């Protein structure tokens, strides 16, 4: 039960950061441009059983575009990403959509305006209307604050499984095992480094 | 007559909101693992207490391990509301695996309450 | 609560 | 072993290619990744296109042929004109041939749609290069080949669809103005034939797949074709009847009719008006008989999400709203069209009940258009009274949370939607106030009888009630407000448990906060409201205290006057009573909530215009922080180790935050309080600075992450914020300059300069920006001292990459910008080596992608050029041009053309036009060239053209000398006309992406 998902959008919009958040829970602060594509399995637990997304995280920078629309072949769903602090990334949404639906003529697509956590928003809510005539679902999202970060996958899962009442559920929590003197001096080393490496974002509410 | 038309066996000792970090030794970097409710769960049949933590929304497990009596909560240099400790077996992501965890809370008050609940649960796992 | 004085002050 | 396809000396092993491709698309993990990098390297080989003819012949993998076409597409769009003409003809021939043979094999035509569409697009890329000048027979032969086969006819519709898109929809960015116009005129010239084929296909039925493809192409044509093709043929009848009956064609047909509803149409032709009525009549008829009746529950249908119902209901909303916003007047006078008009709006009512945020916003945008017109247009509102009555209920029941009900992250999409809902509901209230009141009272009764009671449902109603404030008369409002509050209070009593009693209590306070007119006229009531809020500030239930504080300051902002005067039956202005009990009132509040409370008190106090009473109120308000402050200044100065005591640090930070909060409200009036603490505050700034330094020295840079140092720096940041907040609002600037500035600079500048980078507070830069902004003109020596202390050491922090120290980066260029605006003399005093760093710093700003830096960098450059120009023919300006004019010209050209700074295009163009115009207005007095390198007497115009010609020849060696010469000739001609100037730059940006651009393109304007 797996579905190929292609994620497209201008460079720097947060596509890879968004996927990583879903894969590991981490928030990568650095911008390391994707080269061509990175494929990652992503499983969600639902009341209809597990759903697997084969996420093709493509490069948005033209010089790193690789196979470009070649990555879209046989995609069953898609996310188009832009950055609400960068007008040009919304201006390019019609270009990403064009190249995408020429290869994938009838797939569910979510349009995501990322980085709504930043105060000085530039692409205002009322300006975002491209999804209307193209039948795309739209969500404000923030990979940093997690605002609506689950909505794109939940909506796609409902469209792909054909069940509007599908929900994410809690994966079963097995009993954990019970707990080596030969590694006592080894763990005390790694621990002293960890104690003296400051936690990030110490001003966040959590 | 008209005819008409796995934490269930456990007990919640403590629940608190928290953000969990794991230490990437190779990059000397803390990485977030999840944000949500951290729970101490007492198994009614074994009386063993574990930490179970799930991410908001997706409800995916980001921590699942016994509160071993051997573990020790240590402060982090940059926070008065966090604890660092080594975990020798967490099964949040499949196979058992060891981690250096850090967990941060909304206040130093919640951090201190977590620590005493963490210690109370440690002795419970000593007895059993 | 002194939402009670509120009722009176309103009538 | 997969890497064999990358060896071009050998023949290409098609079976090896197909294996790499399958491993990428169907494989996983490491093998997939390795194949990906191999395929990328293969596709990027500049000779891979020679082997596409092979792949397309002998591969059996459709992905492999797709990739082969992608390789051809790169070649066609970038290097077509560099080829020998034999290869151009050949590539054309085996693309045409490949398409023909795929269409003639029904099995392939059916199972390889991805590959056929890609081949069609590749063909279109050739047409953009070759047609019609080197392919005049393309369209006549396309029309002929269409009749020989249904499959070929269907595919030709796809080709024409893609051609129309590439020429009319996506040409603006991708081709020059001249080439776009050439292709648009070419298509326009032969459209008569194209339409004939399209209409014949539609009229004579046939394959639904052929019909759908023809309609998809028609959708593209409607973006540009003249209206006569639509209104002087039978096509509207076909679209609005035949093709609405079949679900296969229904979706595309509805999109076509939406675009028809936007055609450029004469507004005086009665016949056309009837045709516009008629196709609407037919479409609504087909919907009512073939899809669903007006009464159908579209909310339930949408939720069920069967088939394409959701997309269809979205498309129907777009069609109805589009047509009616333009044409509903056509239906409003003729009584035989009234049923149609209201049935159409009744579908919209039903569509407006769907639970779908983005669709609701589409219908809500239409309702706004309607009710605004009914509010202003005579004799219209009576037509829609039953529609409007239903709409009142829809909007009341779908009210979303406004910014003010923080009892449940801020949601900005929810806030915009609330304001849109409020605007519509306000109009609807004016249109019939009685109906609105009755609906709201009725809804409230069903909250009391438990029929519709719930947390969500009582919130929704209270938000709606609060949103129409200002629409009723004062008497009606009065009766209305009383009833609502009365009913809400009884509802709070009725319920048990604090959670229920909390929701209702918050809703009550929200409604009252929205009706200040009522509070202003009923003092005894207003007084009781405040007193109740105060008692809520002791309630420890989550969210109560926050609500109470937010409501307090919201009411104060609107009713402040009634707190500052003495009321009939009172002995003192109520602000005095608030201040007296402030310690009791706020004892249970968190620090942030205390500061909001003090800020609210500052709002009131600023309405007292008697200076002596205002200053006395200010003194009484600040009594608690001032006493805590006096204590600490005595203790902290005695034993400087207390500042390591984290509790003293927190007390201090909160004292200063209290001052910031009150200063935010009082601005210029805050000066007396600031004077009470100013000098001791700056001494504290120094003492805290020493502790941070001493801590970094004893523990290392990691000290800046510790709670103790972060707490000490909070003190410094709040001190800077307090000073910034006052100076930004001060009215007496003589006192700012003569009392505040010199102690401030002595306190902050040297400390900033002499701290290690990780210990420098970017807030210092932000505070200095405000100082320069407000009084920069009065402290020329102070501005020099600012530059000397922060310029070079901050530049060295940010000039090694684009990511380190992001806040200093942003504040750095905001400071240089205001200095360049207000105190340009300070840059004139710089030593030449330092002024050179200034220029470097500006260009460094150009190269940021960070908008918060790039924009200021470009603006500093523009302002600097203007500052230099204003100096006239003096030695400093002449040396500036000799030293830096071409640095600015070439650095600007670099960011314009490097494809990584497209966000700054407009300002880059502005700066470039300014620089070029200086030379062509002979505003530069000295030669820009060395005495040697050019004959004496040569105009700077000539030398500028030669410098630019040489610069572009080396930076873009694939351009012909003629391209460069025509580009610069047009660019310099157009340096007084920004819109045209920018068009020529955009044309240049197109041409540098390819080989063989036409130099006459630059004569377009
Ligand atoms: N403030 C904020 N920053 C974000 C957010 N999402 C991503 N970022 C940041 O944006 C930058 C770029 O992230 P990245 O995922 O690499 O973008 P990308 O779309 O994958 N780029 P590319 O297409 O070149 O691979 C990173 O610094 C990242 O931390 C967000 O939601 N909020
Ligand atoms: Mg990426």
Author numbering:
A (entry chain A): 9 to 187, 190 to 216
B (entry chain B): 64 to 68, 79 to 201
C (entry chain D): 454 to 464
D (entry chain C): 0 to 376, 414 to 444, 456 to 1052
Reproduce, without paraphrasing, sentences from the article in which this PDB structure was first reported:
The chromosome region maintenance 1 protein (CRM1) or Exportin-1 (XPO1) binds 8–15 residues-long nuclear export signals (NESs) in hundreds of different protein cargoes. NES sequences are very diverse but each usually has 4–5 hydrophobic residues (often Leu/Val/Ile/Phe/Met; labeled Ф0–5) that bind hydrophobic pockets (labeled P0–P4) in a hydrophobic groove formed by HEAT repeats 11 and 12 of CRM1 (9–16). Here, eight new structures of CRM1 bound to diverse NESs show several different and unexpected NES backbone conformations that share only a common one-turn helix element. All NESs also participate in hydrogen bonding with Lys568 of HsCRM1, and mutagenic/structural analysis identifies Lys568 as a selectivity filter that blocks binding of non-NES peptides.
We tested mutants HsCRM1(K568A) and HsCRM1(K568M) for interactions with three previously identified false positive NESs that match NES consensus but do not bind CRM1: peptides from Hexokinase-2 (Hxk2pep: 18DVPKELMQQIENFEKIFTV36, class 3 match), Deformed Epidermal Autoregulatory Factor 1 homolog (DEAF1pep:452SWLYLEEMVNSLLNTAQQ469; class 1a-R match) and COMM domain-containing protein 1 (COMMD1pep; 173KTLSEVEESISTLISQPN190; class 3 match). (C–D) Structures of Hxk2pep (pink) (C) and DEAF1pep (purple) (D) bound to ScCRM1(K579A). The 2.5-turn α-helix of DEAF1pepbinds in the (−) direction and is slightly longer than helices in true (−) NESs. Superpositions of Hxk2pep and DEAF1pep onto wild type CRM1 grooves show the fourth turn of the Hxk2pep helix and the N-terminus of the DEAF1pep helix clashing with ScCRM1 Lys579/MmCRM1 Lys568 side chains. The rest of the mutant ScCRM1(K579A) groove is highly similar to the wild type groove. Therefore, the key feature of the wild type groove that prevents Hxk2pep and DEAF1pep binding is Lys568, which is not only a critical hydrogen bond donor for binding NESs, but its long side chain also blocks binding of sequences that do not meet NES structural requirements. Finally, we find that the HsCRM1 Lys568 side chain acts as a filter that physically selects for NESs with helices that transition to strands or end at the narrow part of the CRM1 groove.
